[PDB]
Every structure is written in structure tokens, then in C-alpha cells.
Amino acid sequence: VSGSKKTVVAFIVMPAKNNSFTVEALKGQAEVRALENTVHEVTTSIGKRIFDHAIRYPHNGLTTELPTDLGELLKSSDKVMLKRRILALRRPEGQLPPIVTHNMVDDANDLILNKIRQVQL
Amino acid sequence: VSGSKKTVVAFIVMPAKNNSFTVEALKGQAEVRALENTVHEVTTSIGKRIFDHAIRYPHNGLTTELPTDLGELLKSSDKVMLKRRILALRRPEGQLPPIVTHNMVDDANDLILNKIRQVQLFNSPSDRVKMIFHPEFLNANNPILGLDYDEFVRGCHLGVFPSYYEPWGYTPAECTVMGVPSITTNVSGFGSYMEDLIETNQAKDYGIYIVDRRFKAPDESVEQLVDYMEEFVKKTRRQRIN
Amino acid sequence: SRDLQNHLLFETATEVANRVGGIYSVLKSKAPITVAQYKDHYHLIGPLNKATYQNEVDILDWKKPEAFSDEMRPVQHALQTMESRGVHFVYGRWLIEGAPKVILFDLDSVRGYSNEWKGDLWSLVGIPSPENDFETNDAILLGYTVAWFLGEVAHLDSQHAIVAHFHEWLAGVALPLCRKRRIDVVTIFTTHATLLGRYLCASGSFDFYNCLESVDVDHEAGRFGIYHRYCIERAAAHSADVFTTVSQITAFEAEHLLKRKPDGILPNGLNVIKFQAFHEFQNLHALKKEKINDFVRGHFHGCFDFDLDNTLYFFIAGRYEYKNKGADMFIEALARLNYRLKVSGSKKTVVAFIVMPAKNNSFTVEALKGQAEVRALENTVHEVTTSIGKRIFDHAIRYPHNGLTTELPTDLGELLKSSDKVMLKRRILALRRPEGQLPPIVTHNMVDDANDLILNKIRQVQLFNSPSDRVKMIFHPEFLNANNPILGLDYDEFVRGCHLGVFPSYYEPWGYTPAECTVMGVPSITTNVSGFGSYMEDLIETNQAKDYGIYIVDRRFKAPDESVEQLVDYMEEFVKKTRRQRINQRNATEALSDLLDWKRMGLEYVKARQLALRRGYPDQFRELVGEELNDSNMDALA
Numbered sequence A: 001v002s003g004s005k006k007t008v009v010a011f012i013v014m015p016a017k018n019n020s021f022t023v024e025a026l027k028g029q030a031e032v033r034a035l036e037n038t039v040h041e042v043t044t045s046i047g048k049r050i051f052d053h054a055i056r057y058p059h060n061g062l063t064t065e066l067p068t069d070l071g072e073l074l075k076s077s078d079k080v081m082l083k084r085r086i087l088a089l090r091r092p093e094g095q096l097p098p099i100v101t102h103n104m105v106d107d108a109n110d111l112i113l114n115k116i117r118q119v120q121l
Numbered sequence B: 001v002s003g004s005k006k007t008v009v010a011f012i013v014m015p016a017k018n019n020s021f022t023v024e025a026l027k028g029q030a031e032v033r034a035l036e037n038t039v040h041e042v043t044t045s046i047g048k049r050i051f052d053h054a055i056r057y058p059h060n061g062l063t064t065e066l067p068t069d070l071g072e073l074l075k076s077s078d079k080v081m082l083k084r085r086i087l088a089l090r091r092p093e094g095q096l097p098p099i100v101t102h103n104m105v106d107d108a109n110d111l112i113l114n115k116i117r118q119v120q121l122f123n124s125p126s127d128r129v130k131m132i133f134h135p136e137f138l139n140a141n142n143p144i145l146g147l148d149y150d151e152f153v154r155g156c157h158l159g160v161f162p163s164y165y166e167p168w169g170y171t172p173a174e175c176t177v178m179g180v181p182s183i184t185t186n187v188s189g190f191g192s193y194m195e196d197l198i199e200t201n202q203a204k205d206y207g208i209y210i211v212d213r214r215f216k217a218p219d220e221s222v223e224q225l226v227d228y229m230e231e232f233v234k235k236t237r238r239q240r241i242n
Numbered sequence C: 001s002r003d004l005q006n007h008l009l010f011e012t013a014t015e016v017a018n019r020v021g022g023i024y025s026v027l028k029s030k031a032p033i034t035v036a037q038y039k040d041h042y043h044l045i046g047p048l049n050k051a052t053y054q055n056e057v058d059i060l061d062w063k064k065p066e067a068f069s070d071e072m073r074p075v076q077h078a079l080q081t082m083e084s085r086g087v088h089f090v091y092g093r094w095l096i097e098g099a100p101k102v103i104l105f106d107l108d109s110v111r112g113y114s115n116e117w118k119g120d121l122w123s124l125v126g127i128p129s130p131e132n133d134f135e136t137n138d139a140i141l142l143g144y145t146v147a148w149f150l151g152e153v154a155h156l157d158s159q160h161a162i163v164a165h166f167h168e169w170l171a172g173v174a175l176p177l178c179r180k181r182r183i184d185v186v187t188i189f190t191t192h193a194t195l196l197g198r199y200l201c202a203s204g205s206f207d208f209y210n211c212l213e214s215v216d217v218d219h220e221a222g223r224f225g226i227y228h229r230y231c232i233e234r235a236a237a238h239s240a241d242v243f244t245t246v247s248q249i250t251a252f253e254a255e256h257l258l259k260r261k262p263d264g265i266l267p268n269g270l271n272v273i274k275f276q277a278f279h280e281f282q283n284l285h286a287l288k289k290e291k292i293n294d295f296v297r298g299h300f301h302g303c304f305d306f307d308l309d310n311t312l313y314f315f316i317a318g319r320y321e322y323k324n325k326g327a328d329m330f331i332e333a334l335a336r337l338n339y340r341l342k343v344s345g346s347k348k349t350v351v352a353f354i355v356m357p358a359k360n361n362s363f364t365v366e367a368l369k370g371q372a373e374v375r376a377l378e379n380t381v382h383e384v385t386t387s388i389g390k391r392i393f394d395h396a397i398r399y400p401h402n403g404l405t406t407e408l409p410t411d412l413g414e415l416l417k418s419s420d421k422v423m424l425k426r427r428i429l430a431l432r433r434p435e436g437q438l439p440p441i442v443t444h445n446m447v448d449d450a451n452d453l454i455l456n457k458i459r460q461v462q463l464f465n466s467p468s469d470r471v472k473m474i475f476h477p478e479f480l481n482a483n484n485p486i487l488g489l490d491y492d493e494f495v496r497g498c499h500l501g502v503f504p505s506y507y508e509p510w511g512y513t514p515a516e517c518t519v520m521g522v523p524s525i526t527t528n529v530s531g532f533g534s535y536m537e538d539l540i541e542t543n544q545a546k547d548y549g550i551y552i553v554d555r556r557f558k559a560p561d562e563s564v565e566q567l568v569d570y571m572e573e574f575v576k577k578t579r580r581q582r583i584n585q586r587n588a589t590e591a592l593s594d595l596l597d598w599k600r601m602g603l604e605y606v607k608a609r610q611l612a613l614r615r616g617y618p619d620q621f622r623e624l625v626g627e628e629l630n631d632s633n634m635d636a637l638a
């Protein structure tokens, strides 16, 4: 209502009977860990090109001190793996981030989970 | 003359009387090193930005899956220290990269420097051959070239040792044991010893070049050496590897 | 008068626009080698996939007078004649290396003429055609159109001898039409399998290679609901001027089942792209193999008692076809290998991978948890070493003052604190696993675990990854892909990382798998009933072959149990090799890659295209050569 732009993530941390984490939980942290690693590869490549322009100025045609055009730093090869990482992060149409991180032994009967569904968060 | 794209940085490693490295030489490294460190810092930031964009797509109005404009990634805070490091590398108008790396004692009457001065390989841009005289022995805790001698050799492409007096010639030999081609002469022990094992036709192909300093005049020899260097320089990478 | 020195070429196939099966890859990868000899003479014909045709085809306007050269004008006017009647058709370039000109015919713009053609076909060659079989329906439409087009081109062009090549029964209908209509082109038909072949081997109870010589084809085709289709494949083989399969073993199968001995073999090439430096693929191997080590460390957490410098990776891969791709022999042979390795007291370990897609519910909790528990150990070791580095540095820098007697530290204690020890122990404790539990034999939750062939076989021979086993098993029922959270390698990457491919096929007209494996410089086991083994047998003395990393199992003249034993013999011959031996062997197998390139396999397509010319016009041929050369083979011809 107040059109706020802030966001509250609320954690409930109360031991309840479970069969450990879910696949979605683990799978998600891994797909992000992979985006991370790919980005870090791409940026050291980017660095090598920035360093070249820098060390070479103002010589072989280089008119400006720094690169001025992303295509000079991000090559086709790099664009492709980033795009694949992103695609791996995408979730099935209309699926939402779960309200629970674990597989619950008796989930239909849990008090927390029942309360949350009633209020529809 | 042949309009060659190739460049040749030639090193000369022969201990002479000196007072350690020129201040310019040590500064040059520290300056380039400091650029490197700045570039890492900048690419770390770029990374956080690529990542944010990628984790967020297609939300918050990110139309494309990747950034497309350099401005999204490279901020002006980054542009500014990068430019400060780039200015520091600047060398005063007309001044050229040295032909030596140490402060010599009796620089004037040095035989090497004088011959280089005579031929005028002063490291100017149009010179397709550059020249670096390093009047000390290679060792891995040199501030400038932290390499042991053997490491340096594996690094290079061609060893050139046109000896007139060389009973054995351990130098083109350690070079050869490490897979680097070598130019030697027929008045050197190694060169003769090798003249025996392969007929000079095939010796070129095994990366052992032998200059004729016996049945040719001094100038036919220099001309042969140069012949060799050019035949080499004409090589493709795939052929150097072979 | 026509020219045998300068001719057209029309390669027709159902997969020209679109990827369906192996054929797409073959035609694609072969494009370069062909345009480099035909340019705009060469053409590819096929049906249109309206739902995808734009991702593949740059759509050229075929009307403007520069689209075709002068001698290739007939084709343009023959294209006109098709637009007269209403025959809609995309023309353009295939967005692929070699960019060949591709004629694509829309099927829908003829669907009406269905009945007349079904009928005309029934009376010429006798081929029935139910309405519900949508494949043959499409296949008839196509064959009739392509026979039309090829007719007009023989009308107009009067300088070039026309040669048309058809691939697989689906695109073969045109072939009878060209013999009845007596049209002036020379036909080639390449079959990449046989219908009755794939079908007689489906159950897997039939003794194929011994009883096909005595099969009643019409009877079997009928038993399978296949009669109409079989007739097309048969008509194509008999109508074609030249008739070819993709391998010796399929030639056998084809002569007794399609009732015509094939004029030649046309093995499938690859587009082998070499690295600047020969030894590069060797570096790739050790990088890729590192990613595998990471998967393995994770997988065997809390149960990791062998040494990765001393373990080898075997793998099988392909469609989940338990019996035809030899998944049974493979598992069986591994259980036998496990015994032979325990008994000889070797300290080597083999980790065997099965990569065959099966219905599943993605990765298990156990698989993902382990990669992460290991990954957490990794991160913590990284924090500790940074600390250690601070303390070593503080030593070096201040020696020999403040009572530092030694150049370096001597007590591990003064480098490794106790906050450090607590951390590392905690991560180790996470890595423990329930007492009794072994590393699993599968990375996924399977839909129907209890009834799964591959898994049941593993449980039968009891390979359960117990510490004492020297052969470990890992079923990964999914295509490898670099965004898997677990084995983050694309397929080709995984291969380079492995040591040995094992593909004991029973029915495999080509087997792209071991061929592709060979091109990455990886040794592989194959069989003599596999089209790639059968092609390799003939190029290399079988004892010299093992030295090039190509082991060939006999599935034809040995007893079943003898085949398994031979398989174990090879596997075990390989495990015995030393690292220097394995390296040298890969270099050798890498060297063989040239013999699998199109630059060498395309010289068989040539030998084919020129048996169709020595047969079409023997008069113009003997003259335009020098003398008369035997013409019963593509072989005897040169």
C-alpha cells in the first residue's frame, strides 16, 4: 500500500522433523556458484584486454586511453557461456521460490506451514 | 625491407663491471606491476556488475541477458585510476627504451655498447629488431628478470653463439637439451661434434644451425648468420613447435 | 551429349533442414568438403520444417538474374516451372560451415495430390500406404516432387550429366520414379541401416547375424506392421544406379534383407578441427580429467581410499539400448575385471561411467550434498593456508632476529593454530557417512528403479562400490551438459578427460560414438558387428590396432561367453599400461583421426558418384577416359 520499495526476507528457524534439504535448494545454490565461476573466468579475460589497451596506448591505432566499446572486451566465446549459465538459473513457468528449504516428514500437518498458507505468503 | 610483421628482441647476457640496475629499469617494472594490480581491482568490480545483471535478468527492466554498453560495467571511478597508471608509464618525448639494464662502469669504452652504438640499434619504433644488454648473470631473485639461466633459455626461441674460440660449447648444448634451437659455428667443439652426426643439410631441420667460420671470409659468415636468422623468422608457430 | 567431367549434384534427404537422427550430422559435417568442388553445382533437396526452418536457413531470393551462374541457369528455369503449378519452396543457404545452396520443398503445397500419387505408386511399384502412417505419406509427397524437379532439370540443362543422391528410405521414393519415367539422371541411394535390421534386433532374443541369411523378408515385414515402409526401402535399393550402405557389416545385412549386394561402402566422416600444437589435446585431457576428479572426490566422500593418480575412467555412452549397445556385456565384463584386478593385487582403480538417458526425477540429495560438503572443505582449506602463509612470511622476513634460529619454521604447531584445527575437523566430520553406507551406483532418482535393466544388472553382479572393489560403478542416466550442478562438463569435454571408451555394440550400422571418441584421441573398444569396428578391421592389422588404441571385440565368430572374456582381456591389457604407455597410445589414436576426416572419407563419395557415371553413360565414359575399366564395384573401378 505505502508503495514502499524495500523488501523483507523473514527466516523461521525452528527444528522440525525433516528428510534433509531439497533438491531445489541444493541445485539452486550450485547453479549460482557456477554463474559465479563463469563470470570470474570472463573477467580475467576482460582484464587481459584492458591491460593490453593500457600498455599499448597511444600506439597501433589506439586513439583513446581506455577501451570505449564493450565488443572490444566481451568476445563471442564469452557471451555464449554466460548465456548458458543464465539459462540454467531460469525456473519452470510460474514456479515460485519455495517457502521452505527442507523436505518435511509431515508437511500437511505442520503448524508453521499451515499458518503460512492460510495467509498466503 | 621485406615488410615483416615479426619483431625480434635480442638479449645479450654477459657479465660486465656494473653498479646494479638502472633506476629506470626497476621503476619500469614497478610501474607496469602497479597497472596490473589496478586492472585486477577494476575487473573485480566489472565482475560484480556482470553478475548482478545476470542473476537479475529479465527482471527490473533488463531487456538483454548480458550488458551491452561499456558504461554499465566500467564506471568513471575506474576510468580515473586506470588513467593515472597509464600516465605513469609515459616516457618523455623522444626518449627510447634503453639498450642496457644496469649502470655501467666506464660506459664509454665498453665493447658491446660501442658496437651497438656503431650499428645504431637504438630501440626506435621502426627497428624490427630490438636490443637488450644485461651485463650480469641471470638468477631468479633478480628484481627485474626473476628467472634462473635454464628457465630463461626455455623461454627464448633461438640461441645465437657465433664463437670463434670454443673448445666445447656447453652453451649451445644446454640450449639444445632444453629443446631450443641454436646457431653455432664449425670452429666450436659442439658445432664440429654435430657436423659429424648429421650432414649439414639435415642439421637445419634438427634445430642446429652451423655457420662456416673457416672456409668463408669474415663477411660471407656474417652474411650466413643473417641468412639463418631470416629463415628462422620466416617460420610459422606450427613450424617452430615441430 | 553431356559432360562427365563437369556435372551437377543433387543430394536429397529427409534431414536437410532439420535434425532428426544421425543423418543430419553426416550431411552437415560433409558440406565443407563438397562445396569445395561443386560450389553452385552442388544442391541439397528436402522437405520444410515450418516450425524451425528459420534458425537454420538464410532465405535467399531465387529470382534475381545473378542468383545462378550461366551454366546453372537451367536450375533456375526448372525452379520457375515448379512455381507455375503452385509448388511453394524456400531457396537459400544453410547457416553452416560450407554454406551450400539448399532447395527446400513445402509438402503442404501438394497434400491435395495425395491420393493420385498413392494410387499411381501402388500400380507402378506396388507400395500400399495407410492414411495414419504420416511418415510415409510425407515420404511419398517428397519423392514425387523431387522426381518432378529432377525431370525438368534434365530437360533444360544439356551440358552437365546430372547425379542425384538419396539418403535413407524416407527420402527414397523418388528412386523408382526415375527408372520407370526413364528420366535422364544417374541415381545413388545410401542406406544407413535397414528397416528389418532395427526391427529383428528390437526384442533382442533374435540371433541376428546367423539367421538373417534365412529370413523371409515379406513375411517378417508383415509381422511387424512394416510392409509398406519395407517396400519403399526395397524399391529404392533396386531402382538406384548405385546402391551403398555405410559399412561392411550393414552391407551383409542389406544384401540378404534388401536382396541386392551393395556396390560400395560410404563410411561417415567427421569435420576434424585440429589444434595449432599437436600436444594440445594432451593438455586438454589433464584439464578435463581434473573436473572428473572433482566429481569423484565428492561422490566418494567419507569413503575415499584409493589414489586418483592411479585410477582410470572407462565409460559407455549412447541411447539407452541395454542389449543392442552392449550395456549388459559391459557391466558383466566389469564384474569379471574386478576379480582379475583384486587377485593380481594391483593398486589401480577403475571408475566406470554409464551415460545413457533414462526417465528420472533429477539428481539425488546425496549427490548434490556431497559436491557441496567437499566444496566447503576446499574453501576452508583455502582460509587456513592464507593464515599459514602469513606466519611463514613473518618468519622469513624477520630471520634471524627475535631469536629465530632456523631459516624456516620447524614445528607445524607454529603455523597451524587451534581455531584452524577446529575448522578443518568440522568439515571432515561433515564428510563422514552413515556407518554401513557405500557411495551409490547412480546419481539420480529414477522413475522405475526396481525394473531398470542397467541398475538390475549392476545389483546382480554386485558391484556396489565397496572399498574392496577395484572397479567402481556410476550410472548417470542423463546427457552430460556443462550446466549440470554435479558433472559440469559437456559431453566432448568428459570424453577428453576419460581414458578408455567401451562400446560393445550388437546393432550399430555406424557407431558415431567410438569414432568421435577416437577423434579426441581416446582409446576405445568396439565390435566387429559395429560399422566402425568393421571399417577399422579393414584398415589395420588387428594386432597393430591395439597399438593405435582401437580394440575390436568379436561378436560374430565367438561364443557369447568368449566375447565377454575377450572384452575383459582388452580392458585388462589396458589397465596394465603405465602412464608413459597411455600417453604414447593416445598420440597414436590421435594420429588415426586423419583417417576419419572427410578429406579422406569423401573420396568414397567420389568413387560412388563416378560409378553412377560409368554406368549411366559407358560410351561417353570410356572415351572421356582412355580405356574400359571394370564396373561391378566402386572398388574394381579404381
Ligand SMILES: O=P(O)(O)OC[C@H]1O[C@H](O)[C@H](O)[C@@H](O)[C@@H]1O
Residues within 6 Å of the ligand: C282, C283, C285, C286, C289, C499, C579, C582, C583
Ligand atoms: O591421465 P593419464 O593417462 O595418467 O595422463 C596424465 C598426463 O596427461 C597429459 O599428457 C598431461 O599433459 C600430462 O602432464 C599428464 O602427466
